[PDB]
Amino acid sequence: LPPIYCPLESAIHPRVHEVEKRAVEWIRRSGMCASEEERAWVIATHSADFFARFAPTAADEDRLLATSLWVYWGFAFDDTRPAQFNALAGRVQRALEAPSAEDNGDRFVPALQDIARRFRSFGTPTQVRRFVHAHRAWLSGVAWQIGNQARGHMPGLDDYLAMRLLSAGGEPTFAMLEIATGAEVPAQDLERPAVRALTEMAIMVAALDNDRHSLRDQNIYSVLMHHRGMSLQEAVEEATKLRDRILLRFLELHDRVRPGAGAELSTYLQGLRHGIRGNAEWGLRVPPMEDAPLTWAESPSDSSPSPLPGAPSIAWWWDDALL
Amino acid sequence: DLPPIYCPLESAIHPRVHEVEKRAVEWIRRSGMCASEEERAWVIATHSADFFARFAPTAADEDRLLATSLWVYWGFAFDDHRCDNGPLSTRPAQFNALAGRVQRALEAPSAEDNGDRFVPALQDIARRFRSFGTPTQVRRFVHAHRAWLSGVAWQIGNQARGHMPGLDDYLAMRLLSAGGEPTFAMLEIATGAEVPAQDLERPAVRALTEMAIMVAALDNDRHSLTDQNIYSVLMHHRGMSLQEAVEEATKLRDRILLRFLELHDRVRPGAGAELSTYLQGLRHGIRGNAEWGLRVPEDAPLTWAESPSDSSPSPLPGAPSIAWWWDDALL
């Protein structure tokens, strides 16, 4: 219902149409897709359009292609019992780390291994490891979510935000910014608690915007309705206040970190901001992407600068002493 | 009929092992980690300070060796009560949530235990790592720790199904579930030695780390002898006797150790100071793992093999997912 607060820069790679056409060929040829139907469903994610918003000035079209390919892959892979999923997640992650691993007729492994090959031809081994760790974090997230669903466990707010941080694919998505842009962010700059908090907050805002984008299971609305006793409308309102509050804290902490930041950390931070907006805008415009004018909230629904009560796993985002 | 371990590597133990052991035993009593005197005594009997004092035997700061040894105690305890025998040990759906909560607590100091006695203990370990290590070094441990839990989740998935993995899946799984990734990721935190990312993430050094982890995991399978281990894996997939399996396992573990040694000798000369200390750690830990395994209930002369049981310098047959360790062009 309520329009999205997102006062962040919107931009899209000028070569997005050229990257999309190469991506559509890669998808047709990959083996990822059994039937013509499934090729069309993956194409209809408009994943080039999504990631071209994340890295809108990427110098090398081929690096933007490679990173865009993983987004298609993630959507195809996400479209299994916990016991078999823990093994699949293990085998798929091994294939990302081990170029010698063999497919064993799993349709998703050669495809992932083709993306990994392209990442290893552009990226420093350091940037590839950052992606690998991000990819395992996402898989852990998915495993947690598949486990909760199989058991009929509706998690509380704390567990739900912890899990969604990972299961919504934001860690591997933001971990591709560097691979798309080129220059390596120094470990000292990327692993700073303040920058880790910016990354997780960008991820969390993108995940809650994706919860919103699918209202029409385990999402913020069911979690709040089950564990607080809310109507749907009361939960939509609470979810928005909560998300808007994480985003204010992101803007606050970004304005403290940005001034001192080196070239590469500065680029990465512009990426978080582009990605938050890009994800929101992509989710508004996706069914030929819709191009009718969009309305954006001028103001946050909740302007508190305090931690979310009921979500202690994210409270540390507000603890400047810790950062 | 189980043959001696081939391990021609430096055996060394920290001169202050007994002082660190004593502080570790005090911490284990205060930790709330152990439900009963019986479980305190079981954790103490892992001699985890003896174990990790062999991995960083010249660690300048005893507080760094202590913090590091604590996680080894914690891991043994967590694994015994939550991974290997807990109602979670065949309940993958529940383990996935626990893995998520425990891993979040390691990453987020603000996180709350929600009744899990393992969580406050790990958070104190993490607090020590954050006080000593760079945020980069702590991120390496955190990533390693998640890798380990992913492997345990795969193993518990297998158990629930009664699925006995083949060699390839078993090696890949056990690379993670034996806890070698977080164990070796604490080397740097014990020595103080921040290893530049360009040096640690080199494919060649990643291969050396994985091989050290793989040899120590196969040595643990040997120390611990339906159960998922290399002997059941070969018995099930190759229709071997236990005796033929024991000999097959020794062959393929020795052949991995020989590749570790060949690659180490090509990597070591070029290495800077911090990577050099890290590689000495891989070697000390392989040996430390094997010797701690043979001595843990102590001082009687050990016998080691003089020769590897197999010395093919080619990838292990039936294990494609590790064949890249022998690819010098990738490495």
Author numbering:
A (entry chain B): 10 to 88, 98 to 234, 243 to 313, 324 to 359
B (entry chain A): 9 to 233, 242 to 313, 326 to 359
The authors write:
Spiroviolene synthase (SvS) from Streptomyces violens was first described by Rabe et al. and represents a bacterial class I diterpene cyclase that we were not able to produce in sufficient quantities for crystallization due to protein instability. Terpene cyclases such as SvS form a variety of complex multicyclic compounds with potent biological activities via carbocationic, electrophilic cyclization cascades of relatively simple substrates, either by metal-ion assisted release of an allylic pyrophosphate (class I mechanism) or by protonation of an oxirane/ene-functionality (class II mechanism). We previously reported a hypothetical ancestor of SvS—SvS-A2 26—which shares 77% sequence identity with the extant enzyme.
